């Protein structure tokens, strides 16, 4: 399928909102979703934060005990659509090996606003970010790099729900910062992004 | 087994996934003719079941079919004898004649933490439903009241969510999983954990969806004795 292909490929792969079929329930479960972002603690950047246990034969998820960031609130983690989310990305990833599907991984959920970066990688093996919102910005372009830092491509995430592929240990990315359109309005970009990490030795939590 | 015991007794729940097992010939058959059996439960969004009680004594093997105890007697005593509350039709004659439904109720039962030794040597009841869940074009956390339990997926059609729902007995969220191929198995322990199940929605909204589980409820009778069959 097209998006396992193109991370094959290229590194990276966008799947634009337009290209998404959003019904009426997902329509009032990204709404919910998407409204705990004027709620995230400072340090212009607000933010939430928690890791979960996965594994992908089972699609079991386990809230891992929080270790610092504010954790993510209690409705966002009660909304379906974040681990419906976090199974569904994970089918978009190339895994090396079948294997893998069934061992432990590590999944870093950021809530990030951003209010008004060099080529970097994430630390991960997947990648996957979610555009929420976008509120009075301009500039903010996802960028994708070489290993060799030497931009390939730059692209721009504008509707909510464009999501973004990636293979953290094949290329670089980096962000563009914003900035107002209106000089007395602030800019706000509401982002979510996981972070997939294989751990075979990670153990079950309590 | 001896990993699927050690998980209930840390997490309280355990997954086998159809993928780790080996379905042969025989096997892959007379699972097909016990999920075939969800297309004729009975129709009374929409939920059709069928249930029924085993006597069962882990030592020997020895699984007798309960007498299917009437509603109208359960309702009219206030007394439902331990099992369920409802209205619902016998398992199939069909059904009851699968050797696969024996088997699982065998085999399951040696994924179980049993804290006794003794307890092997005493019946068990064995309470036993056949669920279909339509949803055409929710129950909160609980426990099932039994000992341990296992829910077998037989089928799933045109169907998302449905995510199985592992709680603390706080009523914490602490797990969640996706019981997506037919014979993805979930083992737990009944009284360590509360569990629950998302609704499920259809894929294609012009079509129905559905999702067809089997599961077992196994509480230790040491009083009960054996009854007519
Ligand atoms: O905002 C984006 O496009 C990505 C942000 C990112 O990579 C990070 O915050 O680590
Ligand atoms: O269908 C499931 O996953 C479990 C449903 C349940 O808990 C019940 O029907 O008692
Ligand atoms: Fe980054
Ligand atoms: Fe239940
Ligand atoms: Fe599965």
Redesign the interface.
Known sequence: TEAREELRANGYSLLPADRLVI?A?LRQHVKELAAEWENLETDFRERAYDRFFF?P???????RPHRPVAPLSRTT??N?LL??LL?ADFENFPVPEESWL?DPWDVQCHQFRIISEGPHRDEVDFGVIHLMGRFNAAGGESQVYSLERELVAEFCLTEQMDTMFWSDGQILHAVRPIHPVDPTKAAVRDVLIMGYKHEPELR?E?
């Open positions: 019904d329930e594994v034969r089972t699609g079991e998820v386990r809230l983690l009660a379906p681990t419906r199974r069934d079950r309590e």
